[PDB]
Design an enzyme around this catalytic site. Structure first.
Site, mmCIF file in Angstrom:
data_model
loop_
_atom_site.group_PDB
_atom_site.id
_atom_site.type_symbol
_atom_site.label_atom_id
_atom_site.label_comp_id
_atom_site.label_asym_id
_atom_site.label_seq_id
_atom_site.Cartn_x
_atom_site.Cartn_y
_atom_site.Cartn_z
ATOM 1 N N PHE A 1 2.036 9.913 2.297
ATOM 2 C CA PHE A 1 2.008 9.781 4.063
ATOM 3 C C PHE A 1 3.263 8.809 4.550
ATOM 4 N N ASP A 2 2.724 7.622 3.536
ATOM 5 C CA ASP A 2 3.322 6.285 4.008
ATOM 6 C C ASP A 2 3.361 5.420 3.307
ATOM 7 N N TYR B 1 -10.110 8.287 10.301
ATOM 8 C CA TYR B 1 -9.773 9.408 11.474
ATOM 9 C C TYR B 1 -10.242 10.625 11.823
ATOM 10 N N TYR C 1 0.483 -1.473 -0.011
ATOM 11 C CA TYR C 1 0.327 -0.003 -0.063
ATOM 12 C C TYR C 1 0.561 1.120 -0.136
HETATM 13 C C1 FK5 Z 1 1.635 5.612 22.010
HETATM 14 C C2 FK5 Z 1 0.148 4.783 22.902
HETATM 15 C C3 FK5 Z 1 0.176 4.959 24.204
HETATM 16 C C4 FK5 Z 1 -0.620 5.694 24.062
HETATM 17 C C5 FK5 Z 1 -1.235 6.120 26.113
HETATM 18 C C6 FK5 Z 1 -1.632 7.229 27.155
HETATM 19 C C7 FK5 Z 1 -0.855 8.650 27.361
HETATM 20 C C8 FK5 Z 1 -1.918 6.423 28.266
HETATM 21 C C9 FK5 Z 1 -3.717 6.782 28.596
HETATM 22 C C10 FK5 Z 1 -3.918 7.546 30.220
HETATM 23 C C11 FK5 Z 1 -4.626 6.258 27.568
HETATM 24 C C12 FK5 Z 1 -5.734 5.220 27.971
HETATM 25 O O1 FK5 Z 1 -4.637 4.003 28.296
HETATM 26 C C13 FK5 Z 1 -4.765 2.804 29.209
HETATM 27 C C14 FK5 Z 1 -5.995 4.363 26.639
HETATM 28 O O2 FK5 Z 1 -7.282 5.433 26.967
HETATM 29 C C15 FK5 Z 1 -8.731 4.924 26.264
HETATM 30 O O3 FK5 Z 1 -9.612 3.759 26.699
HETATM 31 C C16 FK5 Z 1 -10.014 6.466 26.762
HETATM 32 O O4 FK5 Z 1 -10.449 6.442 27.936
HETATM 33 C C17 FK5 Z 1 -10.062 7.361 25.732
HETATM 34 O O5 FK5 Z 1 -10.585 7.283 25.370
HETATM 35 N N1 FK5 Z 1 -9.030 8.130 26.156
HETATM 36 C C18 FK5 Z 1 -7.819 8.846 26.876
HETATM 37 C C19 FK5 Z 1 -7.944 9.717 27.810
HETATM 38 C C20 FK5 Z 1 -8.511 11.326 26.760
HETATM 39 C C21 FK5 Z 1 -9.336 10.658 26.174
HETATM 40 C C22 FK5 Z 1 -9.023 9.503 25.249
HETATM 41 C C23 FK5 Z 1 -7.524 10.244 23.907
HETATM 42 O O6 FK5 Z 1 -7.793 11.019 23.417
HETATM 43 O O7 FK5 Z 1 -6.732 8.806 24.118
HETATM 44 C C24 FK5 Z 1 -5.577 9.122 23.131
HETATM 45 C C25 FK5 Z 1 -5.795 8.165 22.344
HETATM 46 C C26 FK5 Z 1 -6.268 6.631 21.875
HETATM 47 C C27 FK5 Z 1 -6.630 8.635 20.394
HETATM 48 C C28 FK5 Z 1 -6.040 8.713 19.625
HETATM 49 C C29 FK5 Z 1 -4.570 7.775 18.871
HETATM 50 C C30 FK5 Z 1 -4.600 7.456 17.713
HETATM 51 C C31 FK5 Z 1 -5.452 8.771 16.277
HETATM 52 O O8 FK5 Z 1 -5.247 8.634 15.002
HETATM 53 C C32 FK5 Z 1 -6.329 8.462 17.244
HETATM 54 O O9 FK5 Z 1 -8.326 9.314 16.290
HETATM 55 C C33 FK5 Z 1 -9.277 8.364 15.396
HETATM 56 C C34 FK5 Z 1 -7.252 9.019 18.049
HETATM 57 C C35 FK5 Z 1 -4.388 8.261 23.770
HETATM 58 C C36 FK5 Z 1 -4.053 9.764 24.974
HETATM 59 C C37 FK5 Z 1 -2.775 8.521 22.770
HETATM 60 O O10 FK5 Z 1 -3.427 10.303 22.419
HETATM 61 C C38 FK5 Z 1 -1.607 8.305 23.268
HETATM 62 C C39 FK5 Z 1 -1.883 7.327 23.498
HETATM 63 O O11 FK5 Z 1 -2.435 6.084 22.832
HETATM 64 C C40 FK5 Z 1 -8.640 5.027 24.923
HETATM 65 C C41 FK5 Z 1 -9.844 4.061 24.344
HETATM 66 C C42 FK5 Z 1 -7.052 3.323 25.025
HETATM 67 C C43 FK5 Z 1 -6.271 4.432 25.621
HETATM 68 O O12 FK5 Z 1 -5.073 3.306 25.782
HETATM 69 C C44 FK5 Z 1 -4.073 3.919 24.079
HETATM 70 C C1 FK5 Z 2 0.344 -1.333 17.970
HETATM 71 C C2 FK5 Z 2 0.984 0.167 17.635
HETATM 72 C C3 FK5 Z 2 1.355 0.179 15.769
HETATM 73 C C4 FK5 Z 2 1.040 -1.208 15.480
HETATM 74 C C5 FK5 Z 2 1.949 -0.789 13.844
HETATM 75 C C6 FK5 Z 2 1.684 -1.860 13.048
HETATM 76 C C7 FK5 Z 2 1.102 -3.121 12.702
HETATM 77 C C8 FK5 Z 2 2.809 -0.853 11.533
HETATM 78 C C9 FK5 Z 2 1.951 -0.525 10.521
HETATM 79 C C10 FK5 Z 2 2.412 -1.095 9.132
HETATM 80 C C11 FK5 Z 2 1.346 0.703 10.011
HETATM 81 C C12 FK5 Z 2 1.948 1.852 10.064
HETATM 82 O O1 FK5 Z 2 3.350 2.371 10.319
HETATM 83 C C13 FK5 Z 2 4.021 3.336 10.296
HETATM 84 C C14 FK5 Z 2 0.861 3.665 9.884
HETATM 85 O O2 FK5 Z 2 0.390 2.815 9.219
HETATM 86 C C15 FK5 Z 2 -0.504 4.134 8.761
HETATM 87 O O3 FK5 Z 2 0.593 5.670 8.119
HETATM 88 C C16 FK5 Z 2 -1.376 4.250 7.691
HETATM 89 O O4 FK5 Z 2 -1.099 4.019 5.982
HETATM 90 C C17 FK5 Z 2 -2.615 3.448 7.890
HETATM 91 O O5 FK5 Z 2 -3.555 4.546 7.840
HETATM 92 N N1 FK5 Z 2 -3.289 2.019 8.155
HETATM 93 C C18 FK5 Z 2 -1.815 1.650 7.698
HETATM 94 C C19 FK5 Z 2 -2.270 -0.034 6.857
HETATM 95 C C20 FK5 Z 2 -3.692 -0.660 7.010
HETATM 96 C C21 FK5 Z 2 -4.769 0.777 7.017
HETATM 97 C C22 FK5 Z 2 -4.218 1.964 7.914
HETATM 98 C C23 FK5 Z 2 -4.858 0.960 9.333
HETATM 99 O O6 FK5 Z 2 -6.377 1.082 10.016
HETATM 100 O O7 FK5 Z 2 -3.426 1.392 11.002
HETATM 101 C C24 FK5 Z 2 -3.613 0.550 11.412
HETATM 102 C C25 FK5 Z 2 -4.431 1.511 12.512
HETATM 103 C C26 FK5 Z 2 -3.130 2.991 12.884
HETATM 104 C C27 FK5 Z 2 -5.450 2.018 13.178
HETATM 105 C C28 FK5 Z 2 -5.944 2.579 14.745
HETATM 106 C C29 FK5 Z 2 -5.788 1.366 15.881
HETATM 107 C C30 FK5 Z 2 -6.682 2.500 17.149
HETATM 108 C C31 FK5 Z 2 -8.194 2.689 16.729
HETATM 109 O O8 FK5 Z 2 -8.513 3.561 17.480
HETATM 110 C C32 FK5 Z 2 -8.576 3.767 15.242
HETATM 111 O O9 FK5 Z 2 -9.406 3.950 14.988
HETATM 112 C C33 FK5 Z 2 -10.130 4.971 14.589
HETATM 113 C C34 FK5 Z 2 -7.197 3.224 14.150
HETATM 114 C C35 FK5 Z 2 -2.788 -0.156 12.411
HETATM 115 C C36 FK5 Z 2 -2.177 -1.417 11.138
HETATM 116 C C37 FK5 Z 2 -3.177 -0.798 13.941
HETATM 117 O O10 FK5 Z 2 -3.849 -1.420 13.558
HETATM 118 C C38 FK5 Z 2 -1.859 -1.248 14.774
HETATM 119 C C39 FK5 Z 2 -0.382 0.051 14.767
HETATM 120 O O11 FK5 Z 2 -1.085 0.779 15.399
HETATM 121 C C40 FK5 Z 2 -1.108 5.371 9.927
HETATM 122 C C41 FK5 Z 2 -1.732 6.669 9.238
HETATM 123 C C42 FK5 Z 2 -0.190 5.182 10.944
HETATM 124 C C43 FK5 Z 2 -0.088 3.933 11.232
HETATM 125 O O12 FK5 Z 2 1.516 4.187 12.386
HETATM 126 C C44 FK5 Z 2 0.856 3.116 14.260
#
Ligand code: FK5
Ligand code: FK5
Lengths: 107, 107
Positions: free
Chosen positions: A36-37, A82, A26
């Site tokens: 971006f990736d 996202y 991909y």
């Molecule tokens: C680097 C990895 C670990 C890093 C973990 C921490 C600092 C510890 C911290 C207490 C998180 C909790 O760990 C026990 C846990 O909190 C939940 O249970 C929850 O209540 C929640 O919803 N929260 C947390 C409180 C702020 C609001 C919201 C959030 O915004 O959380 C953020 C979140 C998940 C946003 C995604 C980020 C990617 C975007 O693409 C997506 O956008 C669509 C939104 C958290 C803070 C991230 O910024 C950073 C992290 O992930 C999630 C259900 C799952 C999450 O565990 C992972």
């Molecule tokens: C455990 C941590 C590391 C673990 C990382 C890997 C196995 C390596 C793998 C090649 C990912 C890439 O690493 C270079 C990179 O791929 C992106 O660049 C991208 O192109 C993308 O969009 N992809 C990846 C290809 C499948 C579709 C999509 C996705 O679905 O990706 C998923 C994703 C981010 C979904 C969130 C999960 C939380 C939900 O709450 C949120 O729901 C709103 C959706 C990935 C596969 C996760 O399941 C598991 C991971 O995160 C993201 C822009 C950021 C991401 O880096 C993190």
């Protein structure tokens, strides 16, 4: 939702089922084509299974519509990716995503 | 979007600005009240900064409307949280989230 537009056709008969591992290459881009990736740049296919919340929903629904060997562009609305948050420091708020995906094999 | 409903009022004058660190306690629940996470259970406040894509957008917009000491329920639509994907093995597709948030301090 997700729109699937075919670049090269697949075999027209082997479609992904839940619990199979999809092996893909991909490149992810914004709507203006900015990359971006890409797994192709790492020379390592990406693998994932359908049905386990392992990928954004746009991929779960879009790859299910592809057959083995197909190369397609998937255009995914923000709610199926996202949404209003984006992905930190890579994807802005409210972004439609375009993926060039090649389904290489099912394991 | 995000709806903010106040449980206990804050000071009515110190509102979060970008680049400040917000220190909060939270309990996250589905719409039926089922708890999936809580910082209060870990006895450790959660800290984050506004403006850096550090939290889901529902929190960025909802906590900006709270003043120091306020306790509020934030109800966040799926597009401002995890949309159609959900969060793996914790939050289902299309879920509205309810957070009980207490803004303890700004650093
Ligand atoms: C680097 C990895 C670990 C890093 C973990 C921490 C600092 C510890 C911290 C207490 C998180 C909790 O760990 C026990 C846990 O909190 C939940 O249970 C929850 O209540 C929640 O919803 N929260 C947390 C409180 C702020 C609001 C919201 C959030 O915004 O959380 C953020 C979140 C998940 C946003 C995604 C980020 C990617 C975007 O693409 C997506 O956008 C669509 C939104 C958290 C803070 C991230 O910024 C950073 C992290 O992930 C999630 C259900 C799952 C999450 O565990 C992972
Ligand atoms: C455990 C941590 C590391 C673990 C990382 C890997 C196995 C390596 C793998 C090649 C990912 C890439 O690493 C270079 C990179 O791929 C992106 O660049 C991208 O192109 C993308 O969009 N992809 C990846 C290809 C499948 C579709 C999509 C996705 O679905 O990706 C998923 C994703 C981010 C979904 C969130 C999960 C939380 C939900 O709450 C949120 O729901 C709103 C959706 C990935 C596969 C996760 O399941 C598991 C991971 O995160 C993201 C822009 C950021 C991401 O880096 C993190």
């Amino acid at each position: 939702g997700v729109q699937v537009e075919t670049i090269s056709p697949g075999d027209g008969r082997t479609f992904p089922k839940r619990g199979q591992t999809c092996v893909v290459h991909y490149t992810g881009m914004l709507e203006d084509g900015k990359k971006f990736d890409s797994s192709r740049d790492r020379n390592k296919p990406f693998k994932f299974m359908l049905g386990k919340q392992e990928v954004i929903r746009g991929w779960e629904e879009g790859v299910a519509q592809m057959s083995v060997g197909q190369r397609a562009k998937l255009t995914i609305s923000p709610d199926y990716a996202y949404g209003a948050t984006g992905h930190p420091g890579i994807i802005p708020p409210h972004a439609t995503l375009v993926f060039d995906v090649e389904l290489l094999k099912l394991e």
